[PDB]
Amino acid sequence: MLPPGKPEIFKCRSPNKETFTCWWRPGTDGGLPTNYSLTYHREGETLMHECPDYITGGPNSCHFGKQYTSMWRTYIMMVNATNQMGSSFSDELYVDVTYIVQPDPPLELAVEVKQPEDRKPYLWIKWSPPTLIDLKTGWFTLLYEIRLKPEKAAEWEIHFAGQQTEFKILSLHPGQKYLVQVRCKPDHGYWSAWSPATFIQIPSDF
Amino acid sequence: MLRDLFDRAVVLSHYIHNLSSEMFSEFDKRYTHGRGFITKAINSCHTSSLATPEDKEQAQQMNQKDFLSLIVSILRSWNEPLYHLVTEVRGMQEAPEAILSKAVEIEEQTKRLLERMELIVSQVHPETKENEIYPVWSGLPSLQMADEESRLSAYYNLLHCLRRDSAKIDNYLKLLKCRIIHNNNC
Numbered sequence: 001m002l003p004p005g006k007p008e009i010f011k012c013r014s015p016n017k018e019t020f021t022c023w024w025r026p027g028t029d030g031g032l033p034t035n036y037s038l039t040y041h042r043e044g045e046t047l048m049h050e051c052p053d054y055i056t057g058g059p060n061s062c063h064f065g066k067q068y069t070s071m072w073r074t075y076i077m078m079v080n081a082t083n084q085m086g087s088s089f090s091d092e093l094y095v096d097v098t099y100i101v102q103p104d105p106p107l108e109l110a111v112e113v114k115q116p117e118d119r120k121p122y123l124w125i126k127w128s129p130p131t132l133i134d135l136k137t138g139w140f141t142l143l144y145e146i147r148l149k150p151e152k153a154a155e156w157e158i159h160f161a162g163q164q165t166e167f168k169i170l171s172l173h174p175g176q177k178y179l180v181q182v183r184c185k186p187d188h189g190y191w192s193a194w195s196p197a198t199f200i201q202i203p204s205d206f
Numbered sequence: 207m208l209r210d211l212f213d214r215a216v217v218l219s220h221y222i223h224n225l226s227s228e229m230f231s232e233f234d235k236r237y238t239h240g241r242g243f244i245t246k247a248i249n250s251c252h253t254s255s256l257a258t259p260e261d262k263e264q265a266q267q268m269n270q271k272d273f274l275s276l277i278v279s280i281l282r283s284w285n286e287p288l289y290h291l292v293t294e295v296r297g298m299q300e301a302p303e304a305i306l307s308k309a310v311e312i313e314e315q316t317k318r319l320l321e322r323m324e325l326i327v328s329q330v331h332p333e334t335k336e337n338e339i340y341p342v343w344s345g346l347p348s349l350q351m352a353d354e355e356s357r358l359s360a361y362y363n364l365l366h367c368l369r370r371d372s373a374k375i376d377n378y379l380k381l382l383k384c385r386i387i388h389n390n391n392c
C-alpha cells in the first residue's frame with residue numbers, strides 16, 4: 001500500500017568527455033518502485049527530455065551517448081519513482097560533464113628488465129591508454145602515475161610519468177619481486193582506479 | 207618556432223584553468239556553499255553568444271583559422287572582467303588573501319597567453335583581418351551592489367563563467383596544437 005520513497009541521483013561519471021552515465025538509488029521507507037523515469041533539461045533550453053538509454057549503464061542508470069552529451073552546458077536532472085500507489089521525485093541535480101571526468105584504468109601494463117653494457121641496468125615499464133579516449137586530436141589529455149612495491153613493504157614508491165606511455169626505473173633491489181600498477185587522470189579531473197598488478201622478479205645479477 | 211610557442215601557450219592555459227577552478231571552489235566553499243547560487247549560475251555568461259564548439263565533432267568541424275580567432279576573442283573579452291575582479295577584491299578592507307592572489311595571477315597570465323596567441327596567429331595565418339569583434343562584459347554594477355546576496359551571486363556567476371571559459375580555451379588550444387603541429391596524431 002505504500003508509494004515509493006524519495007529517490008537520489010547519487011553519482012555521475014564521464015570516462016572520456018564524450019559520453020556519461022548517472023546512477024540513482026531508492027529512498028527506503030517507501031514501497032517498491034515499479035517504474036523510474038529520469039528527466040532533465042539543459043541550461044539555455046526549455047525542452048524537457050527523457051533519459052535516452054536506461055539499459056547500457058545497468059541497474060537504476062541513465063546513459064547519455066555521444067549524441068546526447070556535451071561539455072560546458074549544465075544538465076538539470078531529476079528522477080521519479082512510481083508505483084500503483086503514487087510517486088516520488090528526487091531533488092534536482094546540476095551536472096556539468098567537464099567536472100565529472102574519471103577515466104578507466106590504463107591497459108596492457110608490461111614490465112621488462114633491461115641490462116645494457118657498463119651503464120645502469122633498469123626496469124622498463126610500458127602501458128596503453130584506456131580504450132575510447134581521444135588522445136590523438138587533443139580532445140582529451142591523459143597523465144599517468146606508476147606505483148610499485150615488493151610484498152610486505154610498508155610504502156609504495158610512486159612515479160609521475162606525465163603523458164608518456166613508458167617509463168624507466170633504476171634503483172630496484174637485486175633478487176626482489178615487485179608488484180607494479182598504473183593509473184591515469186585527465187589533465188583536469190579524477191584519477192582512475194589502479195590497473196591490475198603485473199609482477200616482476202628483479203634478477204640477482206642486477 | 208611554432209612548437210615552442212604552442213607548448214608555452216598550453217602551459218599557461220592549463221595553469222590558468224586550474225587556478226580559475228581552485229578560485230571558484232574556494233569562493234564557493236567560503237561564501238555560497240549552502241545555496242541555490244548554482245541554480246542561478248544558469249545561462250549567464252557574457253561569452254555565451256559566441257559560437258563555441260561544445261563537443262569533439264563540432265571542434266573537428268571548425269577550421270583552424272576561425273578556431274584561433276575564437277580563442278583570441280574569448281581571451282580579449284576577459285581583459286575587462288578580470289581587471290574589475292582584481293580591482294574590486296583588492297579594494298576590500300578585508301580581502302580574502304588566497305582568492306585575491308589567484309585572481310591577480312590569472313589576470314596577469316591571461317594577458318601573457320593572449321600575447322602568445324597573437325604570435326601564433328601571425329605565424330600560422332599572417333593576413334587574418336585585424337578586426338576585433340568580441341563580446342562585451344558589462345557586469346560591474348552588480349559586483350558593486352550593497353545588497354550582499356545579489357553581490358555574492360554576481361561574483362559567483364563571474365567565477366563560474368571564468369572557470370568555464372578557461373576550460374574551453376585550454377581544451378581548444380590542446381586540440382589546435384594536435385591538429386596544427388601533429389596532424390591529429392598526438
Ligand SMILES: [Cl-]
Pocket residue numbers: 189190191
Ligand atoms: Cl582523484
Ligand code: NA
Pocket residue numbers: 013014015019020021063064
Ligand atoms: Na558513459
Ligand code: NA
Pocket residue numbers: 054055058059060061062
Ligand atoms: Na535504469
Ligand code: NA
Pocket residue numbers: 018065066067068069070261262
Ligand atoms: Na556529444
